[model samples]
Target: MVSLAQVRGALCGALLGDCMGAEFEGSDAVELPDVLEFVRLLEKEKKAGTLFYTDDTAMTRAVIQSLIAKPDFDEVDMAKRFAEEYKKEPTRGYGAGVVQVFKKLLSPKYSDVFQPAREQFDGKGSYGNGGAMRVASIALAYPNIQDVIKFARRSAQLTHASPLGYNGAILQALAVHFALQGELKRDTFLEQLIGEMERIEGLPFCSRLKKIKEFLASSNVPKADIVDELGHGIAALESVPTAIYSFLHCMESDPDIPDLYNNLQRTIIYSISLGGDTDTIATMAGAIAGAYYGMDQVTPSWKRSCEAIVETEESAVKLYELYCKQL
Candidate 1:
């Protein structure tokens, strides 16, 4: 069983990743000192209390709030929260398409919660990372693996109705659910995930994960290759696998770097080093790392650098109380 520490780790890890990684979101340029020094620099302003979190963390908090208010899950209420939060704060860097969905949800005649998303992309819907980024709560709130998949799908479809989008959300949630077990074996973790994905999503997505094992098993791989293969983009197809690889790579891969940083630090920095969609990738990676290692494993300064990190810390413990009853 997972402890409150791990639960807190899962959420706070994602929050710090979003807060710090947003600094280098779309740029791959390494315009700073070494990873250690750069991270310390990032934390400086936050220590003085001027930190900020992006829409990623904001939407994540919205998801948690919706679930906390409705344990069994409420699509309409959750949909409202997604829209209401974005409406209240438009400077969150929301995607053009997603902003439309939120607006549609806020419309008076919008009874069908799925319509807004389904209508996006000419009824094809989006396959963005929005789903995967906010799914940590679903993993934390639902102990049953199948339930994790189900609720994560429902949550993702709120804005992303495409299979690629929701399936990636399921994969992300599964990653957290497994990590939440408090112990994870690399081989078993990969094998079981492959098996499940093959059933729920078929070969392509699962095929991407195949490289996660190969990369981890290798003595070491280049950061460039990691980005090239796994990808760093708005697409769920690219980002989710990349984040999973980042977490695993930090834990056991990259033999050349021997304890350069703790698992969480390595995970987040390695993600930033890759250079695309830095915040979201790092956020997902940190969530998995934190879930496995627990909240106590996170660094004090790192936590301090994050904006609204205290909120994440409190939410994790509160979410853990809800998660405990499911077991």
Candidate 2:
């Protein structure tokens, strides 16, 4: 019984994470005190205005628009939206490789939009986490797990054709899919991901889930060790697992993250403190946590500080309604 609130929570939560985590996207050393103080200021300041979102939220909004505009997955429509969104805001921190893909997508010559992505890295394609970062809406729009997995990969293929990239999208979509089901048994959840990733032959994802299980079983593992084992890079194989660990780790309150914040805030704050690709990792974590916790649990001030919080919520509502009709 995933409610509309949870849908709104998942979408809006991803938006909040992207906006807030953009504060320290590519830092080598992000301290807990600094993250805590920044969030505190956002909460206290009456006129902080809206925080700017990067490519993460930009692509996410495109997914939402494309999904709502069409009845089912439409690669051409989705690809066009991605290109138009990037063209309209060329400085949204998109990777150089992807920008080239978008340029080809916008041109009249490229009939197959996926061709540019397939040709990236001299035909090896990209293994970036871009696919995973924008996949939550796909999970929400489809009630069936298989559809979520299928469409997530298809959507990712528009810009990311590598197995790691598309599979990372599947893994993230699965996280939100399971979270949308409500209360989770932590061990059961990890086991389920491991099982599904294995079925998909995403061995990289399976190994990371195994590491997460072991880390969770142990007590107070240092953040550096987690970063070392799970990684915090832009590669889907690196940061997607880190994002999963962030959500699962913050399930219990941490001594470092202040007690004043709820689990969702703690999730975002803890994610940024990891010091690499903070925006994508936190955005992914926030989507999972928000699906589990629902929108109302999000800190009011933090929500207010996000640029597209209202629009994101509306998109969530539309997706939720669409999900219901299909079910």
Candidate 3:
């Protein structure tokens, strides 16, 4: 059984990783330039000492707080929390569309219009990884697979009405679930997830599932090649699976604390090294690593630097308590 400390560590570690990676939101290359160089850059920018979480940690905070406040996955309460947090700190780095939506949702006059407009984005809504980025809390919240899927979908649909977006959250949550189990063999984890994906019918999200399966099956592929095939963008199809693949690739080496830290640093560097959607990919990868390794596995400096660490940690702990009660 995974301990509460491990869960908290995973959540906090992810926040730390997201904040650290946010510094290199947009950089070029196929492999991370230099882990120490980025660390130095962060120190020079004063961002290293003061972690600044992006949309990933901010929204995840909302999810965890919501589940704590309303264990039933209340949509209205979740929306309210999201709006409150989004408005309370304008500095929280939100995506372009999400910033606009949150601003609109917070406006009393436009509150009614916000949801509709958010759902109509480009007529297909957002297929972005925005939903997936913040969904780890849902996996921690629900014990049953059915409830996990239900809560994940409900939480995602609040902002991302697109089927693709919801699917991404579901898959990401499932990945976290399995990671928490710590029962999966590194070699078979991908295959097991593929089986889980196929079990669900009418899952419009299975297209990416198929692609991920195909990518994971083929070995000896370089990171650059995988990134090209899987992409490193905000799109659900692009971000979630790519992060999972990165985690699997690094997991094969049986990493220790120092190794894991080095691995994550190298992974984020390589992820950002891809450039297109470096921050999001790094965020997802960080979340997975944190989930698998726990908080202690993350660097103390990184944890201390996280901007919302205290608040997010409190919320994660509260949610864990609530989950315990539910269980």
Candidate 4:
């Protein structure tokens, strides 16, 4: 029952959301004035059209390309492709840690040593949100839950070898998978996810999940209180829970198009207003909203204004077809 429209909607929604959030990537709430004011700035600056995506979308492209080229989620092959793509586009807004790793991958002497160094970070390893941000494409590309989980883990382990980073990606991919199947209820979704984490003994990620659950359970708390409580961006604790929190907030609101769009704009604006990881938070919110609303629900103006329209559309369509085939 997966309509082509829904597939298209999900794909376009992801890109559009990413682009919409790109404008306020690093601004804090105080610096940006207010949400409405930021929206006005976007309109006035003509940034309302064809918004550029950052590392989130770039890595997502790598994920899709890997799936397309292999048709199987081969971790090593995918990792190679990811490293290769990063090499081709060195200035694609990568983080400091990631850039270092990718550069080593391109080096002759250090290529084999990259994994050991990554594993050496803090003795335990990275718990960054880099994995979660790019793993949504797996939800779109695969239908089976088991396959989705496997693919997500492999994708995360390619660069983010740490358990925290890997689990964050797995959880987010599961969320998207649940949403794609229209099987999520706000409460049950959280509960079941917590249960799954417990069963799997996600020691590194569970504590963070518990905290997120507690925060979500107690609604009506101000954004400021939870902003730092969750995180700003890229970090696993910051990105994963923040994205989930936004999705829960929006779903709980259940607004119509005008209201929803206004709310997302405001949310991203406020998220950026939080100052740290503004763009990343906004981008995370954008992805969840895109998944929740689908393409038809998004405003036409926003879609038209997004950069890389042709490439984005092509990737989305191809992913959709692949999803259909797998389903």
Candidate 5:
């Protein structure tokens, strides 16, 4: 049985990464101490009752809210919730291009879910990280990997219509789905994921998934090389692999990182170090690590540091109860 702790860990953990990493959104250097020091201030802010999560967690919460309302996963209503959440709080540092997607989603004239996305960029849909960023709830809701891929892909289609866009969400969901299972062997995890992607892409890992194998075996490579090869941008190709790399690298024995650091902390810090789109990358990485480590492993201070964690915890529990019944 998938424990309740894993579900709670997954959502709140992603929220923690999103809230914590927001401080250094575009910088190359995400000073590790600054991360912890920021957490120190979050305690004061939390006490003051004025903490906030960015678009990453905000959109994620919308998804959880949708899951709660529509237990069967209705795409039309779920798309509306995305629009509703974006409108409710407009200043959550959402991406430039996605604002158009949201605007179209809210339009009364909008009918074809595929039309808005398909019309974007002259008939090419967005391949942004928007899809992958909010998909943790999908992974939490489904026990099967195939179901995880199916729903994550369909969910991404609401905004991002590209194969890569949907595929990135698929990859993120797959990571969390496989991770929820206990005692993961890192190599086998990558192998299993790549194996599925190979079928999906019908292309080699180098051309399609890119750097997943290198990441699994990707130790001793300098941080610059990793970022250069895997990327740290807003694109699905850039961010998704970087998140996977962060989760895999943190699990390995890093010569630079001390052994005492917990997986959740290491996952967040390592993702932040990748630099660009730090919030989304760390959020994805944290989701994977949380599924692997469970809620008990996340530090108390980190939980206290994050905004909207209580809501995330509540959503996680509700999703967990629903998930358990399906199992």
Candidate 6:
């Protein structure tokens, strides 16, 4: 029953989040008003050239293209695509750690595709949000819930080998999986996420899921509190839960966001206002919001402002077809 509209929404949502949030990626202080004003300019068509996406969307596009071109999940092929993408666009703001992995992955001597990432951080592997940032497409491409989790973990393992890193990808994929169902009861959604994470990562993810529920129950929870408790850093543990909270928080409405913006827009704006890892966080949040709202919720002007909106939407359609074949 998954509509083509929902698939397009998720992919397009991720693109807009990455492009819009890129404007304030590393800033520690991002005011709500400023984010709104930025949106205002985009709406008025006052902003400059196309909103070029950063590493978030760049790597995500690689993931989608690889998945669409290959059978089920091919680590070697996906790994090669990732390296080729990095070679094609070295200045996409790829983190230095991942760039090193990409270089190793490209070498003829490197047969073990996962070894390079496993070698990261002195063999501890990266716990960064990089894996989670690009995982929405994996969920979209797989219809079976089990297939979603299994392949999401495997896909993330190409770049992020740590349990925390890949588990974050699992959580994000599950979130999108749930959202595509078309109707959600928020409390039940949080509970299901908590239950699944409890089985997967035990306490780390469980506690964060609890916090999201708690934050939603309370009134006027400060943005600082959300950033401090859930985190807004580069680590998967830091940013993934924060992104989930952003999506859930804006599902209804937010005083901080203007009424003119819908839930999807609010998700992106609120995620950026957290002021750290803006592009990645918003990209993740936007994926979930888009799944729930559908592509129609995306404004026409905003779509025009992004670099690859048309192509992204086209891939979403292909991904949707691929998903149906599985079903």
- The most accurate candidate by TM-score is 2
Residue-by-residue lDDT tens digits, candidate 6, 115-234: 999999989888988999999987788888888889889889888989999999999999999999878889988887887888887578788889899899998999989998999988
Off by over 4 Å in 4: 28-33, 41-50, 109-123, 202-204, 254-274
Which scores higher on lDDT, 2 or 4?
Answer: 2
State the C-alpha lDDT per candidate: 0.84, 0.90, 0.70, 0.67, 0.81, 0.89
Q: lDDT rank, highest first?
A: 2, 6, 1, 5, 3, 4
Candidates 2 and 5 compared: the better one by TM-score is 2
Q: Write down the RMSD of candidate 3 (Cα, Å).
A: 3.4
Clashing pairs in 2: none
Residues 110-159, candidate 4: write the lDDT tens digits. Answer: 54533733653765667777777788888888989888888888788767
Cα displacement (Å) at residue 44, model 1: 5.1
By lDDT, the best candidate is 2
Error of 6 at 252 (Å): 1.3
Alpha-carbon error at 170 in model 3, in Å? Answer: 0.7
Return the TM-score for each candidate structure. 0.95, 0.98, 0.86, 0.86, 0.93, 0.98
TM-score for model 5? 0.93
Superior by TM-score: candidate 2 or candidate 3? 2
> Which candidate, 3 or 5, would have the higher lDDT against the true structure?
5
**57-87 per-residue lDDT for model 3 (tens digits):** 7788888877877888888788878889988
Model 1, span 192-291: residue lDDT tens: 7888899897566797899888888776587778778888888999999999988877775445343756788778888777778888998999999999
Model 5 regions more than 4 Å off: 31-51, 204-210
Better of 1 and 6 by lDDT: 6
For candidate 2, the per-residue lDDT at 272 reads: 93
Model 5 lDDT tens row, 1-327: 688899998887798788777877998766656765665576555453244679988889888888888877888888888888889988998888778888998898788765677777777888888899999889899887777888899888888888878888888888888888886788887877887887877643224344666556555888888788888888888888788878887886656556676878888877887788899998999999998898986877678667776777878889997798668
